[PDB]
Amino acid sequence: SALTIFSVKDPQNSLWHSTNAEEIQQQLNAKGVRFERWQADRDLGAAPTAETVIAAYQHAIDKLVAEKGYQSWDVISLRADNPQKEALREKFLNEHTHGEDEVRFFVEGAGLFCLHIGDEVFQVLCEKNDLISVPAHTPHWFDMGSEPNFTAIRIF
Ligand SMILES: [Fe+2]
């Protein structure tokens, strides 16, 4: 719901910062990044799992991006009753990239998605409200800082 882009020399001095539908889309698409707003009106119950959240927003993946054979979709949820929430930070906080642009849609929970393109650091908040998809060759990392639960959908 927000986009920030400053020079690599000004990391704390967020120079350009704005949060608008056309504004976030113009900045994202202007860099070859797709962006859309999805409606999370599908209820999977109180706790959202990967298999269910998968079958429900499954029909939404068909309109997301039609290309290649799309191997499959997966979900990344963190539970507080699983000691793997602490080690999972170094596990998702490292740089991981693929040679194909993947898309991620959050249906339950919010995560801070940071993008790195050239000498600029992008800071955009992600919520189960809309959707975000970055290009291949572009590294992305999730912001943990804590052990909160968040449901995400990966398609590539
Ligand atoms: Fe990825």
From Swiss-Prot:
InterPro entries: ARD, ARD_bac, RmlC-like_jellyroll, RmlC_Cupin_sf. GO terms for molecular function: acireductone dioxygenase (Ni2+-requiring) activity; acireductone dioxygenase [iron(II)-requiring] activity; iron ion binding; nickel cation binding. Changing residue 140 to F: Strong decrease in expression of soluble protein. Changing residue 98 to S: Loss of dioxygenase activity, and little affinity for either Ni(2+) or Fe(2+) ions. Changing residue 140 to A: No expression of soluble protein. Its cofactor is Fe(2+); Mg(2+); Ni(2+); Mn(2+). Fe(2+) binds at residues 96, 98, 102, 140. The record marks 101 as: May play a role in transmitting local conformational changes. Ni(2+) binds at residues 96, 98, 102, 140. Keywords: Amino-acid biosynthesis, Dioxygenase, Iron, Metal-binding, Methionine biosynthesis, Nickel, Oxidoreductase. The record marks 104 as: Important to generate the dianion. Belongs to the acireductone dioxygenase (ARD) family. HAMAP family: Salvage_MtnD (MF_01682). Monomer. This is Acireductone dioxygenase. It comes from Klebsiella oxytoca.
